[PDB]
């Protein structure tokens, strides 16, 4: 029984993803998050080896298991008459990247590098496990303030990774690629790299580069903040108009701007504590 083994706390937020509450496992006081999703609003369903129909996020979070702390952990899930309830890991103290950027403004490159690097390791893990997130953005990134470790969250718009074209999409438009905007077609990896380019720009400039569809398809990048030449280069590369012109994950991590990243704990001590 859900309501029994978990003590519900205040509402942390709600929106397209549903409603998320703070909570604690009555068992051992472990802090958790309780996410409720209405059955009538599920964009993509999946099936487990059982044959049980469930929200994609459940299938996806089960596929990316491992002590790897770069991806939020799914502790348990329950099905209700008209909804599903997911019990997720909850770091404390924590702050999503969006709020962090909002309060601090553009991030120093050293910090942005550490954060971007951890996001890349997390995405590579998902891909290696056959999982495509499809909604990479600051709002979907949690920061474990004490350890300086980032967690990718909300795989509700994700899908199993495939080598063929995707014609469906329910992620965030301003983070979606030109090919999706113009043709409603995109491939997994190259689309992910574009969103990562949007994310990196967001980190070093304090806001996203494109607002309107016309800007996304034109892909002309203008820096409103002082950004190094090497960082500018990596960003423009990730945002290449032609999908095949974008760097692979390996190329991104071997890029000059990505060398000598700080360790998570060093990151916390220098920029978070
Ligand atoms: F940290 C936290 F909140 F306990 C937590 C822990 C683990 C997972 C999830 C989770 N899974 N999906 C979504 C979609 C949106 C969203 N938005 C929040 C993000 C923080 C601030 C309040 C709104 N969280 N989320 C949230």
From Swiss-Prot:
Q: What EC class does the entry list?
A: transferase
> What's an example Gene Ontology biological process for this entry?
apoptotic process
Q: Which Pfam families match?
A: Pkinase
Q: What is the effect of changing residue 161 to F?
A: Decreased kinase activity
Phosphoserine sites (modified residues): 66, 229
Keyword Membrane in the entry? The reply is yes
Q: Which catalytic residues are annotated?
A: 135 (proton acceptor)
What is this protein's tissue specificity according to the annotation?
Expressed primarily in cells of the hematopoietic and germline lineages. Isoform 1 and isoform 2 are both expressed in prostate cancer cell lines.
Protein name, as recorded: Serine/threonine-protein kinase pim-1
- Species for this entry: Homo sapiens (Human)
